[PDB]
């Protein structure tokens, strides 16, 4: 379900951060390169931010998107 | 003209820090969870373009639009929205590649406006807007519940809408001219939105238009008529959308704002509607608030809305540059 | 009691040949493309239970509910709907395991009712229904667009709802408060579950003399700061209305709940949350839910597939329960 | 996302191009999961609406059969 895809994506963010100690690039978070997949990943991150699970960082409009787990 | 961006400061749920919301020249989908502040972006646009009805912007009174503070932020001192219009097509009677309108309201309800830096009056802003043919509350703005309106709308109200779009002895000829066009657009667009079906616009008094209303005759999936009042939510939505698009195909408004107009559409209809929005994106700008994967996956750019302890924020993504 | 099945003949978009629609004792999702006739199934239920408003069922006159013909069919001579209730729990003051109610409307607008084969008056039907906690005007029936009613209605109309759930209505104040406090807790509990990080509650305008006042809703989606339910967006309103409905059913489960696209304005996460709330509740009440959302139908015990074939609605019943065992 | 509907019509016009008889629903649902068995069902309903196929079921909850057109 959707309740799962979000929890998995969160674990993926946590795991990477637990090793790099630096904000994750949105790109390295999107599996396949297709509008449908990109947007779904984007959407889930938005959901995780609402949940106070992650923090999304962007310096300028349409600029690079970075993610940091809470 | 078309909206390049909006900047909010102390407006509703967006807190104090300036929030920059950019828009695609074409199709932008505004997404995010329930209660994130998505519809507030639509209210922001109603606000800058001179909106006067607190209720229309989901507020008890105008001052209610001022961010009231949160866990990490204090009550804003005022609510402000600035909208940036690309004016390369010179739609505005201003010889500048960028028109900027800004409205601010204080706790006492007093609003102040500015046009390209110089302060203007509300009337002046409306005149410049009508001049660019931008309706703050025209048929081009479809908020939640506006579809149950294009449906409940009386035949006279509906024809009056066309009178307006036609531009007011030989006036019958002008009206008929634009009516014949929009009617054709409606039939073509509906057939495409409802495969195997058809629909058309009909004047009650075709010989003397202004003495009667403008009705809708729909044959959804078959060749059998069916009062629009008797359709279900889904078909009503499609029908209203076919009408809205039939108008835009004839006279493209600078921009269209849709707030969850796909709430009652099945996935195949979200797809057809999404494709119609893209194709229409070439002549007008479309800002669409949606909760549907299908609608979102079809937009040029996406504006993601999220909260943070009662405070809204956005993140902009370009599906093109994302490739 | 619960609905075992519906039988439609010449009713709205369902043509002339009898159509049988089976329902799970628990959670049933009614799915299909737009314009298939899903909503009309809700109308059929409203119809058999004595609904008088043609407008509510999307018709000019009650007579217009009669199938008017299609590509391959002539107009029906009348519309008839039969509803079969399982009465093993004796919710109906009839000593039978099966209670059948049937209504038929003719072109002249007259209706004939039948109660287990014996002709009955609408009044006789309404009374028997009242006895079983069922009504065409019940809060348990949420047609498309009604969702917000439990928001836009007046605090007085709201309290009146609770008056109904409490009892015949002194010593009454005691019964009311008892009912009010439980539902109020359910409301807060459920609203929190649906809007994580938020809270909400029910408030009487007059605590000492409840009956001289109304019942208000005080929501805090953010959790700390209150918010007028009218300042909310479509999804928030839907969640608030739903939490209220479920708050009542958790206290006094109604025989069945009919929802028509109450998930139109909910996001996927909330569709799931509501679907879970429905599954858990369908253990004490029957739930018939029309939906266009995948997340919602996927959580159903049984599914009613509605499709249109030649301008005539058709149905297919699938049981995920007895389908997995294959 | 209407390709899933079109690819479903393919396996229906193929298992029929051979068998020449009504296709059992069971032989159309890939993974034995609730979400998938429900989508397969939805898509068939969509197909019937379009006029692509015809769903057959003799009794409530009975066996479902699909005949293309």
From Swiss-Prot, chain C:
Top-level division of the source organism's lineage: Archaea
Compartments reported by the entry: Cytoplasm
Residues binding ATP, per UniProt:
33-40
| Any one Pfam family match given in the protein's UniProt record, by short name | SMC_N
Assembly and oligomerization? Homodimer.
Q: What does this protein do?
A: Required for chromosome condensation and partitioning. Binds single-stranded but not double-stranded DNA.
What protein family is recorded? Belongs to the SMC family.
Under which name does UniProt file this protein?
Chromosome partition protein Smc
Gene designation per UniProt: smc
